[PDB]
Design a protein around this ligand. Structure first.
Ligand SMILES: CN(CCOc1ccc(C[C@@H]2SC(=O)NC2=O)cc1)c1ccccn1
Lengths: 12, 269
């Protein structure tokens, strides 16, 4: 999940 | 059910999705079709129809490019646009009610599978039979010129063009596409999902919002919804080509080096 996870977590 | 509060709520969902879509995706279909058919008063896209015009338009507005051959330089740009796309789709997905409250790994999985089908879907907005709009409508690359590119690059887009031609015939607008796109992301049958039932629950709600949207927005096309559900399977089938063509960077294309994010979306799929 690494990079997609990171995108999914970033409030934005 | 006809005109009940539940149907009013399905419209509210539709409008919410459409607003999130406006916000997630800078160039919309309405804006893309205006350029494609030469309706705008103010637009002027740069046309790339051959190698020379490519030399000219390449720098629309550094050491990313290096001294690489044209077909590779082009697909380096294709890789970036598609990373922008994945990021916008991810943001859009997060605006779908219920999405952020799903298990995070299921979110991942849904995006991992959904993102390619959504790229195909949204790319059609940017395509006619002649070429595709790029760099938010600032450029147009002809189908013919992309075919002229050396193997395997010269036939990447061609399948995307064929899908677009048939999907565009359905004449969906951006408000129809917002719901359709959401339906695709909340697919309860992706491999590896942990909790399938809460995903199917959001989708069923979305499918109903979709059905109502198409009756209200496309009153003369009684089978539209049935046709859309069919394009959903089509999409699953077309995207495997795409997935495989990006594994060509295993080798050959020893000078490709795939973007880290695209690598993640491709492997174990
Ligand atoms: C020709 N173009 C866009 C081509 O149109 C696309 C076709 C396929 C994709 C999917 C991506 S490409 C990849 O590597 N993996 C993906 O998911 C994304 C875009 C260019 C070229 C240069 C600059 C901007 N635009």
């Amino acid at each position: 999940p690494s990079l997609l996870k990171k995108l999914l977590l970033a409030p934005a | 059910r006809g005109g009940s509060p539940e149907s009013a709520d399905l419209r509210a969902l539709a409008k919410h999705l459409y607003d999130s879509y406006i916000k997630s995706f800078p160039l919309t279909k309405a804006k893309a079709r205006a350029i494609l058919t030469g309706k705008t008063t103010d637009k002027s896209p740069f046309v790339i129809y051959d190698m020379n015009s490519l030399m000219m338009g390449e720098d629309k507005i550094p050491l990313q490019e290096q001294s690489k051959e044209v077909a590779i330089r082009i697909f380096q740009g294709c890789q970036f646009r598609s990373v922008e796309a994945v990021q916008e789709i991810t943001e859009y997905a997060k605006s779908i009610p219920g999405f952020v409250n799903l298990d995070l790994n299921d979110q991942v999985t849904l995006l991992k599978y959904g993102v390619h089908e959504i790229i195909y879907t949204m790319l059609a907005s940017l395509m006619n039979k002649d070429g595709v709009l790029i760099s938010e409508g600032q450029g147009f690359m002809t189908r013919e010129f992309l075919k002229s590119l050396r193997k395997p690059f010269g036939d990447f887009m061609e399948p995307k063009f064929e899908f677009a031609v048939k999907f565009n015939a359905l004449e969906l607008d951006d408000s129809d596409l917002a719901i359709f796109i959401a339906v695709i992301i909340l697919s309860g049958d992706r491999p590896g999902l942990l909790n399938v039932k809460p995903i199917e629950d959001i989708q069923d709600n979305l499918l109903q919002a979709l059905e109502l949207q198409l009756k209200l927005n496309h009153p003369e096309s009684s089978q539209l919804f049935a046709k859309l559900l069919q394009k959903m399977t089509d999409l699953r089938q077309i995207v495997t080509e795409h997935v495989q063509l990006l594994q060509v960077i295993k080798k050959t294309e020893t000078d490709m080096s795939l973007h880290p994010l695209l690598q993640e979306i491709y492997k174990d799929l």
